[PDB]
Design a protein around this ligand. Structure first.
Ligand SMILES: *[C@H]1O[C@H](CO)[C@@H](O[C@@H]2O[C@H](CO[C@H]3OC[C@@H](O)[C@H](O)[C@H]3O)[C@@H](O[C@@H]3O[C@H](CO[C@H]4OC[C@@H](O)[C@H](O)[C@H]4O)[C@@H](O[C@@H]4O[C@H](CO)[C@@H](O)[C@H](O)[C@H]4O)[C@H](O)[C@H]3O)[C@H](O)[C@H]2O)[C@H](O)[C@H]1F
Length: 370
């Protein structure tokens, strides 16, 4: 025992408000919104330029057409490093955000995010034992504190674990098992809660290649898989050209340039999106395991001027509709990655300071795809 036990009040198993299976719950969610760069920000909830989460925001998210929110949460910076005890004040703040999301009739997925990297960048044999110990200690606390919420609340054990090979995959399977056991151990509604497990690098191709089995669960039919999606990188995230490749400003049938043609895609088009999603349908969905698509977005390039900009914006919108639509058609639940920014290279579709829509075009694209 590196750390004390935090499974200090285990409760009797409680199935009340927990009647849905993972498949049934996935049936209720078609469009999801990440509260990005907020509860996971290093330095505090407001450290990365977003205000504290308010009811008014969650209300706008609901009223705009989202069924669910994914809330990235940081924990390690709030914990005593000797004991792994998480601040009581932080636990209550997270609980409070969950409560308000569930009061606006949203499903809610809470994780341990990148979190400064303690687990995420350490899917390795040398770190396996210490990280399991912290995974267990944190999840005991988070689950105990959030135990009484009904099936509107789901937990995801990690964010984007960096497992690049079979030996790292084995370590990841260990981290994911530690998460399930920790949560189930607390009892209460946590005996039945739907949990979400992440694939290697949350990458479709690597998941298809390395994923072996789901963790063992004392509960029946209560697990989902998770991947993320930024294909093609050159369009969605790349901000400068490199020796290895050029940025794409434009994407989709009908929105390609004839003037700056080096800025059209050379890969990662519709057929590729289709092919990648079909891998997750076969590995998971077709086997009765839904798949959460926890993170996707193509950033805005507002450093373009004139018809270049207009064309980028059209393709950028279509990209979000196509991903949303083609993911839903295959049993993946799309959660848009929103960082709150309204400036160049950002992904915020709301203006968080005013509780209004900043990017109506991408909002409509998402809803149409939905
Ligand atoms: C899936 O991928 C998503 C897309 O990459 C991830 O979201 C992105 O997260 C990074 C944080 O990265 C850490 O967590 C993820 C790990 O994979 C990384 O290895 C870690 O480094 C965010 O970057 C942070 O952004 C904040 C906020 O400001 C920026 O973003 C908003 C935009 O409007 C603005 O123009 C950007 O400047 C940065 O905080 C600011 O920093 C400056 C400089 O010190 C300071 O003046 C500001 O006051 C301060 O607010 C921060 O330094 C930067 O790391 C991405 O914005 C986010 O999209 C997702 O986490 C992953 F799971």
């Amino acid at each position: 025992g590196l750390y004390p036990s935090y499974n200090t009040s285990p409760a009797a198993p409680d199935s009340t408000g927990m009647q849905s299976t993972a498949v049934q719950l996935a049936g209720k969610i078609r469009l999801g919104w990440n509260i990005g760069n907020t509860m996971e920000a290093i330095g505090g909830e407001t450290a990365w330029g977003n205000p504290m989460v308010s009811n008014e925001l969650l209300k706008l998210v609901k009223d705009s057409g989202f069924d669910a929110v994914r809330i990235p949460v940081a924990w390690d910076q709030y914990a005593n490093q000797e004991s792994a005890e998480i601040s009581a004040a932080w636990l209550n703040r997270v609980k409070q955000v969950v409560q308000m999301a569930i009061d606006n009739e949203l499903y809610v997925l809470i994780n341990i995010h990148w979190d400064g990297g303690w687990l995420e960048n350490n899917i390795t044999p040398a770190k396996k034992d210490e990280n399991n110990a912290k995974q267990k200690a944190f999840w005991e606390q988070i689950a105990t504190h959030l135990r009484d919420f009904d099936e509107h609340l789901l937990f995801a054990g990690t964010n984007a674990p960096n497992a690049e090979n079979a030996e790292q995959m084995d370590v990841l399977n260990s981290y994911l098992q530690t998460f399930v056991d920790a949560v189930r151990s607390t009892g209460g509604k946590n005996a039945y809660r739907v949990l979400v497990l992440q694939g290697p690098v949350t990458d479709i191709e690597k998941t298809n290649e390395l994923w072996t089995h789901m963790p063992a669960d004392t509960a029946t039919d209560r697990l989902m898989a998770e991947v993320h999606f930024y294909t093609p990188y050159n369009f969605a995230l790349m901000r400068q050209d490199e020796s290895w490749g050029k940025q794409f400003y434009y994407w989709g049938e009908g929105f390609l340039s004839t003037t700056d043609t080096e800025r059209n895609p050379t890969w990662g088009e519709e057929a590729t999106i289709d092919q990648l999603f079909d891998l997750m349908k076969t590995k998971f969905v077709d086997q009765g395991i839904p798949v959460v698509l926890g993170e996707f977005s193509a950033m805005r390039r507002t450093n373009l001027t004139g018809d270049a900009l207009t064309l980028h914006l059209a393709g950028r919108a279509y990209y979000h509709k196509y991903v949303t639509q083609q993911a839903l058609a295959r049993g993946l639940l799309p959660f848009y990655w929103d960082n709150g920014g309204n400036d160049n290279f950002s992904s915020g579709i709301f203006n968080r300071q005013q509780n209004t829509v900043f990017d109506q075009q991408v909002l409509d694209a998402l809803l149409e795809g939905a």
